[PDB]
C-alpha cells in the first residue's frame, strides 16, 4: 500500500489534504458515458413514501444456490423450500432445469410429491434457445401453475463483444423466445403457465431499446390486466448510485406499453452495496415486484436482502406479509441451506445487531425501556403492545424472537 | 416456530398477489414523518448531481469501531490500524475518548510522546459536554501539533423527553456551554492548532429546524471563519428510514446553516436499514464534504459506513478517491487482525467470492470481454492493463485491486 503523494485537486480546500492516489481511474467511465445520461425528467419516486408490501419472489433455490461454494443437497434444497413456503413467499423460483440436471430433478420431486401449496407459483429460469425452452417446459409437467421466465443479455456490452450483433438482432432473440413460449403453452394445458422476460444487464442497457424489446415480447405473449406479463429488469452489475436506477424504473413503468397488463419486477444485484436502497428507490418509483434472497446471498457481491427489506417494512409500520417473528430460525436455516453465514453485523439478523457495548448507550436504552413500562401502568396496558420508543434499537428485539444485549 | 401469513390482504391488493397479512406488530412503529416530522426540503437537487470528487475522509475505526468490538484492540493492534489509516491516505483520524477510557487516553499520550503523527494528519478526539471531560480532552492531546476535538450531545425528539427530561433551549445551552468550554481550553493551550466538530447527535431522529438552531448557536460560540472551519457532523445514529430522506435533510441543512462557506458539512450514517452507503452517496450530492466511516463498515450493531465501498465505488466510476485500494487483500487481513472480526464473503470489492463467477454463461461472456479487450490492445499497441475495461460481470479489474478473477 503507498501512501497517495499525486498533487491535489485544482480547487481543493486547503483543509484537505488529502493527494491523488496512483490508481487506473482512467480505466473506468462515468455512469453516463458507459451506458448513457438519465431520460427523466420530473421524477415522483423521492415524495412517495412506500405504503405497503411489494409482491415478493425468493430467488434462493436457483439463483442463490448457483451463487454456493457447496451446492445445496435434496435435502438442504426441500428444507429452504419449505421455509421459504412456511414464511409466506407465493411466488419461488425453483430452477434452470434445461441447463442443470439436478434442478431438473427437484422440480420433479416438488411436482410428483406433491409439495407446492396452492397459493404458490413455482418460477422457472431458461435461456431462449428452442430446445432448451421446451426441457423446460417438460420439466413443469403436471404443475398446476409455472412461471417461465426467459432471458437474453440486451446491453451495449454484451451486443458487441458477446453476441457481436445488432438491437434488432438481439430484440429477435427475445420475441423468438417468446414465441416459442406462446406455442410450448399451448402444447401443455391444464397447467397455467405465466412468463416473465428480462432484458438481462438492463443497468448496462438504453433504456429506449429496454422499452423497445419489452414492448416487444409483450406484443407476442399478449397479456392481460387479469393474465399480465413480468418485465423483470436486473441490476445484472449494480453501475451506480441507487437514485439512478429508480429513474429508470420510473421511466419504464410510465413509458412501458399496456403498462396495466405488466408486474414491473426489480431484481437488485449489490456490486456497489447499494441493492437495499436501489430496491426501495425503485419500489418507490412504481415497481410491483422485488426479486432477492434471505440475508442477501447470489453471486458475488449478491442478491438483494428479502430480510432487510421486509423488516424495513415492518419497522416503519407497513406490514411485510411475511413472518419474522423468529429472525434466529430464520437464519439458522438459511446458514444450514446455503452453507454461508449470516455476518454479525447484518441487519436484524446478526449477531451483533441487538448488543450496546457503550455505557452512555445502555444507561439511554434503560431510560428508554423504565420510561416504557411506567406508561405501560399508567395505561394499564401491556408494555409489550405499546409504540417502541428506545433509543438506539429501532426495533424491540423480542419482535423477531431476539433479545437486547447490554455488553 | 414460523407459521404463514393468514391474514386478509390489503384493500386493492390485485387478485394475482397471493400475499396475506402477518401477525407482525406493526402498530408498534410509525411512519418515519410522524415518528419525527415530514420532509423540510423544497427543489431538492441532489437527485441530479454526479459525484466528480473525493469527500474529505474521515476514519473513525479506532475509537467508533473500537468500541463495538467483542474484544477490544490491544495497543498493537490499535498501532497496526493506525498505520494502515495512514499509509493508505487517510488525514482526519479518530483516536479516542480519553475522558471515558483510560486506555483510549493511553493511547493518544503515546502517538503525540512518540511522534507518531504525520504532519499531514489531524487526530480526532470525541468528549461529551461536560466541563470535566472536556478539560481531560485537552489534557489528552497535550503537545499535538493539531487536532479536531469533536463535542456532542443528542438533541433527538424521544432522548429530550426519556433521556434527558428537558426542553429544547435546556438541550441548546448543553451544547453552548460545550462550546464555551472548548474555547475557553484552547486559549489555556497554546502551540496546538484546535479545530472543532459538533454533531447534534441522533440528528435522524430531531427536528431539522432544531438542528439548525443548535448548530447555529454552536457556531456563534466557536466563530468559524473559511481559513478556520468549524464540522458540523451530522449522523444517523439510527438509520430511521430511506436514503433519499438522509439526503434531503443534508441538502436542507446545506442550504440553512448560517456561515455555510465557514462550515465542513460532515456524514456519519449507520447501517441499520441497510442503506448506509446509499445515504452517504446521496448525501455527498445534497452538498456535505467529508463523511465519517470505517473500513469494512465495522461500528455498533450494523456498523458505519464503509469506507472501502465509498472509495472504491468512486474508482470503479472513473472517480480519483485519493486512497490507496491497490492491494485490497492487505487492507483486509489488517482489518481482521485489528477488529478480530471477519470481512463477509459478499462484501462489496474485499469480500471472499466478489471476484467469482460460478455461472457457465457469465464464464463464457467473461472470456469475450477479456479476448476482446486483448484484441483490443494489440491492435493499438498498448498495454491491455491500461486500457478501458470492459468485461460482462466485473465491474472492475481484479488485478487493479491485487484480487484475481476465478472462474469455479
Ligand atoms: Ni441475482
Ligand atoms: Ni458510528
Known sequence: IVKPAGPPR???????????????????????????????????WPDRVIDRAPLWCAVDLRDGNQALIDPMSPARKRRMFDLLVRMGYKEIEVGFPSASQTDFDFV???????????????????????????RTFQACSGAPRAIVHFYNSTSILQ????????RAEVQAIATDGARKCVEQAAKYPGTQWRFEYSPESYTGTELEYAKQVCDAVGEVIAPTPERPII??????????????????????????????????????????????????????????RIEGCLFGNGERTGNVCLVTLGLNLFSRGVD?????????????????????????????????????????????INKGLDAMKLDADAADCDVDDMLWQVPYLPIDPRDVGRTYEAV
Open 159 to 166: 451486443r458487441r463483444v458477446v453476441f457481436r450483433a445488432n
Open 10 to 44: 485544482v480547487g481543493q480546500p486547503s483543509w484537505n489534504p488529502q493527494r491523488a492516489s496512483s490508481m487506473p481511474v482512467n480505466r473506468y467511465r462515468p455512469f453516463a458515458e458507459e451506458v448513457e445520461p438519465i431520460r427523466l425528467r420530473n421524477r415522483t
Open 320 to 364: 411485510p406479509q411475511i413472518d419474522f417473528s423468529n429472525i434466529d430460525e430464520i437464519r439458522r436455516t438459511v446458514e444450514y441451506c446455503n452453507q454461508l453465514p449470516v455476518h454479525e453485523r447484518h441487519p436484524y439478523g446478526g449477531d451483533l445487531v441487538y448488543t450496546a457495548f457503550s455505557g452512555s448507550h445502555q444507561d439511554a
Open 231 to 288: 418485465f423483470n429488469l436486473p441490476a445484472t452489475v449494480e453501475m451506480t448510485t441507487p437514485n439512478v436506477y429508480a429513474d429508470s424504473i420510473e421511466w419504464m413503468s410510465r413509458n412501458l406499453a399496456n403498462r396495466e397488463s405488466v408486474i414491473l419486477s426489480l431484481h437488485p444485484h449489490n456490486d456497489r452495496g447499494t441493492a437495499v436502497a436501489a430496491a426501495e428507490l425503485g419500489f418507490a418509483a412504481g415497481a410491483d
Open 108 to 134: 420433479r420431486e416438488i411436482i410428483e410429491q406433491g409439495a407446492i401449496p396452492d397459493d404458490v407459483t413455482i418460477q422457472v429460469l431458461t435461456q431462449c434457445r428452442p430446445e432448451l425452452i421446451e
